[PDB]
């Protein structure tokens, strides 16, 4: 296995809570597919008549185009659409979850054929949540060992998602904040992931969608709000992050016309945010950073929104803790020697931090870097005066880039150890 070989045939797979990012090291950007599968059950004979036999026999479809093909036909898709990693962990005995993960592992390899004889298998590098227990590592290794009989696979390794971000950013000493649909992971990196400093929050992009849905109902779009794809489009289009929420709300109630907006959902369907509710745009961006505001609590009191802790194995995911407090807690839980190395660089990653400021709104609205700096200046002025905060260039692709760098560089002489939790396995 030469150096040139590894620059062609390293293959990265990032298993996100809502999207899998995947493909060879030679791609300029990864491909993406939703982390879900559709079971084909209870279908009318009218519909089943025109489905290929091999697909009907399999009874489970993955791939965005393919799931879209059959979604209209399934009447009850809450029961039949399975999301195996919606909180980052597939439970040990959840057989449907692990079947969907194996099908996704198969589909992603199947998108990249062979046409060069000096190829003898991929070198696969998989990224999983820092929340993943030991049994998840074993089950993922098992999936790729089984698929090695269907595809040429030379070697396989696994690493945690926050470490991959640090590698992609060329940052050996830092604090990573990685936020997707399901949760936020906060972890210090000093030549390795410092486990004792991991802090997890039970909020993500799903919470921004949840409050968008409730705003839409209040405006009068309850029927639209029942469609998850539509809530997602509205969230991305109209969400705003305040510099400081109370100041942003006062501005939008004094001059609501600055903040009214419209969203086209289809050639026929359009949504309008009117004057009375224009200020609520700031709730959609704020909720991931800090949910402790009366205007958010109002929906909780109505039993229309949940903000709560969760427990997965040995880790508690905190519902209410704000992002700044999580950074400060993470540092407190590691030694002073490590703190002095990593506290200089805070790095935000993941799609939940993608927010942009519309032209003209710089007085009241913020991007994620600014919102986090404001929070740190309030809760720890000393830290704030010495730290640099940044957002990765491609928020959804950073983990995958670090996975392919890791797979390229990790020595092939380093065999997997259950004790150190690093190394290669060879099918």
């Amino acid at each position: 296995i030469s150096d040139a070989y590894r620059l062609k045939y390293t293959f990265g797979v990032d298993f996100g809570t809502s999207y899998v990012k995947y493909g060879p090291i030679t791609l300029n950007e990864p491909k993406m597919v939703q982390t879900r599968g559709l079971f084909l059950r209870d279908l009318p004979e009218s519909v089943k008549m025109r489905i290929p036999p091999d697909v009907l026999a399999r009874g489970l479809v993955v791939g965005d185009e393919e799931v879209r093909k059959y979604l209209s036909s399934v009447r009850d898709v809450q029961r039949n659409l399975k999301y195996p990693l919606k909180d980052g962990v597939a439970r040990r005995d959840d057989e449907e979850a692990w079947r969907v993960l194996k099908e996704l592992a198969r589909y992603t390899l199947a998108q990249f054929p062979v046409s060069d004889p000096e190829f003898a298998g991929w070198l696969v590098a998989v990224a999983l949540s820092a929340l993943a227990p030991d049994y998840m590592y074993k089950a993922i290794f098992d999936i790729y060992d089984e698929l090695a009989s269907e595809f040429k696979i030379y070697a396989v390794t696994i690493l945690p998602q926050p470490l991959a971000v640090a590698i992609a950013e060329n940052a050996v000493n830092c604090v990573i904040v990685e936020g997707g649909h399901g949760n936020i992971q906060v972890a210090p990196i000093s030549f390795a992931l410092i486990r004792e400093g991991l802090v997890a929050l039970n909020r993500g992009g799903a919470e921004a969608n949840a409050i968008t849905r409730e705003i839409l109902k209040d405006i009068g779009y309850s029927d639209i709000a029942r469609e998850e794809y539509a809530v997602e489009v509205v969230k991305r289009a109209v969400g705003l992050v305040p510099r400081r929420l109370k100041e942003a709300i006062r501005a939008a109630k004094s001059d609501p016309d600055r903040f009214v907006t419209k969203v086209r959902l289809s050639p026929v369907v359009e949504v309008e945010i009117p004057r009375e509710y224009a200020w609520t745009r700031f709730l959609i961006g704020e909720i991931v950073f800090d949910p402790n505001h009366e205007e958010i609590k109002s929906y909780i009191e109505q039993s229309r929104l949940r903000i709560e802790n969760a427990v997965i194995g040995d880790v508690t995911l905190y519902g209410e803790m704000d992002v700044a407090s999580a950074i400060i807690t993470s540092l407190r839980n590691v030694s002073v020697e490590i703190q002095e190395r990593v506290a200089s660089q805070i790095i935000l990653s993941g799609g939940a931090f993608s927010w942009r400021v519309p032209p003209g709104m710089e007085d009241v609205a913020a991007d994620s870097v600014t919102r986090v700096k404001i929070a740190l200046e309030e809760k720890s002025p000393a830290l704030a005066s010495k730290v640099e905060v940044r957002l990765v260039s491609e928020p959804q692709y950073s983990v995958w880039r670090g996975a392919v760098i890791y797979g390229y560089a990790l020595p092939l002489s380093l065999e997997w150890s259950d004790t150190t939790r690093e190394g290669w396995r060879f099918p």
Partner: peptide, 16 residues
Amino acid sequence: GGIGENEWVKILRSKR
């Protein structure tokens, strides 16, 4: 963001 300048490459290649 190039591989040649990435300090992690030397760190990872040193592992035994």
